[PDB]
Amino acid sequence: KISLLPPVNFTIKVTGLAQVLLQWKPNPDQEQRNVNLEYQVKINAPKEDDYETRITESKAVTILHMGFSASVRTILQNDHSLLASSWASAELHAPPGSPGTSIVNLTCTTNTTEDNYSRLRSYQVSLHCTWMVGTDAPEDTQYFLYYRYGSWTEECQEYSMDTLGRNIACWFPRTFILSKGRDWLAVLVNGSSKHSAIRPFDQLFALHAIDQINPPLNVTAEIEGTRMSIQWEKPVSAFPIHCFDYEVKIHNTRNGYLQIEKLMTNAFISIIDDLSKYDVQVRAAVSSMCREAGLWSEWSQPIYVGF
Amino acid sequence: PTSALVKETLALLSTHRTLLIANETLRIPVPVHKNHQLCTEEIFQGIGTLESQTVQGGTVERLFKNLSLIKKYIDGQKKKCGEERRRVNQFLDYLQEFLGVMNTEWIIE
Amino acid sequence: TEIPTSALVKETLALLSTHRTLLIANETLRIPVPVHKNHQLCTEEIFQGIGTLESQTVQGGTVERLFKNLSLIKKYIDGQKKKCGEERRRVNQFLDYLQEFLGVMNTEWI
Numbered sequence: 197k198i199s200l201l202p203p204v205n206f207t208i209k210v211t212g213l214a215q216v217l218l219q220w221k222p223n224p225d226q227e228q229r230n231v232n233l234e235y236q237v238k239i240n241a242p243k244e245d246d247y248e249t250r251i252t253e254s255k256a257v258t259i260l261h262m263g264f265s266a267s268v269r270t271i272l273q274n275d276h277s278l279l280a281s282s283w284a285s286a287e288l289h290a291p292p293g294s295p296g297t298s299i300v301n302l303t304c305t306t307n308t309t310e311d312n313y314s315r316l317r318s319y320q321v322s323l324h325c326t327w328m329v330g331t332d333a334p335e336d337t338q339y340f341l342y343y344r345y346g347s348w349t350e351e352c353q354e355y356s357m358d359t360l361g362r363n364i365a366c367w368f369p370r371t372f373i374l375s376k377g378r379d380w381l382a383v384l385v386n387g388s389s390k391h392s393a394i395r396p397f398d399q400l401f402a403l404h405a406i407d408q409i410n411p412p413l414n415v416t417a418e419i420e421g422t423r424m425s426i427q428w429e430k431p432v433s434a435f436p437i438h439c440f441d442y443e444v445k446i447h448n449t450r451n452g453y454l455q456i457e458k459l460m461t462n463a464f465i466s467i468i469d470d471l472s473k474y475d476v477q478v479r480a481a482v483s484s485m486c487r488e489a490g491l492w493s494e495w496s497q498p499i500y501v502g503f
Numbered sequence: 504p505t506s507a508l509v510k511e512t513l514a515l516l517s518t519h520r521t522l523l524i525a526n527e528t529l530r531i532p533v534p535v536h537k538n539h540q541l542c543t544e545e546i547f548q549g550i551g552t553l554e555s556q557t558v559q560g561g562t563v564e565r566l567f568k569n570l571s572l573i574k575k576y577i578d579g580q581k582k583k584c585g586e587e588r589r590r591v592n593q594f595l596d597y598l599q600e601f602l603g604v605m606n607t608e609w610i611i612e
Numbered sequence: 613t614e615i616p617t618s619a620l621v622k623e624t625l626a627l628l629s630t631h632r633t634l635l636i637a638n639e640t641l642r643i644p645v646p647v648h649k650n651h652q653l654c655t656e657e658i659f660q661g662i663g664t665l666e667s668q669t670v671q672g673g674t675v676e677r678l679f680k681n682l683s684l685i686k687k688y689i690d691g692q693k694k695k696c697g698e699e700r701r702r703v704n705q706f707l708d709y710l711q712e713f714l715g716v717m718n719t720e721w722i
């Protein structure tokens with residue numbers, strides 16, 4: 197019969213954009229360790245979780261402008277029994293600031309391009325955010341944007357302002373964001389002003405939700421008697437050939453007749469008629485088989501075949 | 504081998520989600536970082552425990568089989584690491600390959 | 613554990629290129645080398661071979677700093693494996709991970 201006591205010196209500390217570290221220490225007054233104790237952590241706000249852990253520290257990626265709050269408890273499992281202690285608790289308050297002082301409607305967008313130097317094919321990722329100023333913001337207030345990807349945090353260098361000073365957009369032509377990346381992008385927007393505190397605002401984006409896939413390039417259509425050969429190239433991206441879904445759209449400008457084919461290869465053979473001008477476009481997305489569902493590209497520019 | 508497999512076992516995973524995610528008391532090891540490949544041993548023991556926990560009626564049985572073949576492939580890749588002894592200059596090249604990579608494309612806490 | 617900075621990794625690379633000639637100097641040595649390029653699967657063997665170069669070479673000079681660097685990269689890699697299973701989470705969250713894994717396995721190998 198053992199009697200479990202809660203962990204002690206439970207603290208939360210901010211270690212970077214939308215990132216914290218929970219720590220605690222085993223209870224000095226615990227029935228001596230000859231049994232291995234573990235911990236149960238429960239995140240209470242802003243976004244619920246619990247999970248068990250086996251050491252006395254835990255990282256959590258989370259939004260902070262709403263304040264964060266967490267609890268931890270000690271547990272002991274074995275043959276015939278589970279036991280768990282009362283909880284310790286801790287929280288960070290929401291940052292200081294009036295309600296409408298805060299940035300609103302932040303959208304962020306990623307896109308890939310190719311380094312046309314370096315002798316070796318690697319790629320580059322830009323980032324582009326916009327937001328609006330929020331209704332209570334005082335006239336003199338200035339907003340600043342920071343981003344984080346994995347261990348690298350940068351502050352925005354080149355903004356775009358509304359017609360009286362205030363930053364409303366940001367652009368990074370390069371970043372430390374990996375293309376094929378599978379981690380969260382965290383964005384923070386601070387502010388300041390003569391006449392009071394400004395509420396920060398942060399959020400977490402998943403890359404697949406904001407990566408503006410590039411259209412296919414070099415779509416070619418060769419019309420031969422009655423068959424049309426369409427062809428295109430893999431979009432500019434760091435996902436390999438076998439990772440794309442395409443939609444090919446063939447449109448008869450003579451009568452309206454429309455054909456769209458979804459497929460994973462780079463070529464398509466469609467039967468056609470010989471008295472029409474057709475326009476053909478192609479669209480692209482990366483396969484749910486390589487990453488979670490994201491966005492479709494624009495359609496390539498119309499090319500025309502037939503008379 | 505096993506190209507065909509994965510793509511199919513993904514949508515299989517997708518359709519059997521609500522069923523799998525129904526034991527809310529169950530806890531499985533999940534890495535805290537994204538170098539997935541360092542963690543296959545854990546990833547596979549979690550599937551094992553999931554599998555012993557979930558009722559073996561339906562097309563779900565197929566999801567597990569599939570995961571077990573993927574398991575086989577990975578086991579084989581792993582045996583290929585220590586299979587073929589070679590001259591030192593060879594091993595050094597590997598090492599420097601391994602170090603470049605560890606450098607350009609792993610996150611680092 | 614020590615975050616192995618990318619200058620350190622980078623320094624080690626340089627130190628490696630230097631001592632190449634000293635290191636090969638055992639014609640009798642054979643060392644397991646992986647046929648495929650999924651390093652993350654082979655970290656075990658990588659350090660095992662390092663281990664045998666080490667056990668053979670004389671430590672001193674910048675040659676010691678080499679194995680000291682590798683050693684410190686090895687501990688880091690173990691930090692990272694322990695990190696594979698110190699937290700148990702809801703099925704929902706393990707499913708997400710399994711999914712990522714499969715997708716990266718699909719996009720990186722062949």
Ligand SMILES: OC[C@H]1O[C@@H](O)[C@H](O)[C@@H](O)[C@@H]1O
Binds near residue numbers: 210211212213
């Ligand atoms: O703790 C690291 C800090 O870096 C600063 O540049 C940012 O302004 C803070 O928001 C951040 O938390």
Ligand SMILES: OC[C@H]1O[C@@H](O)[C@H](O)[C@@H](O)[C@@H]1O
Binds near residue numbers: 238240267283284285
């Ligand atoms: O309001 C959140 C509460 O949830 C439970 O985990 C516990 O009863 C408290 O320690 C905690 O503060």
Ligand SMILES: OC[C@H]1O[C@@H](O)[C@H](O)[C@@H](O)[C@@H]1O
Binds near residue numbers: 324367
């Ligand atoms: O000027 C801000 C930036 O806006 C983006 O939409 C464009 O892609 C950049 O080329 C441009 O410099």
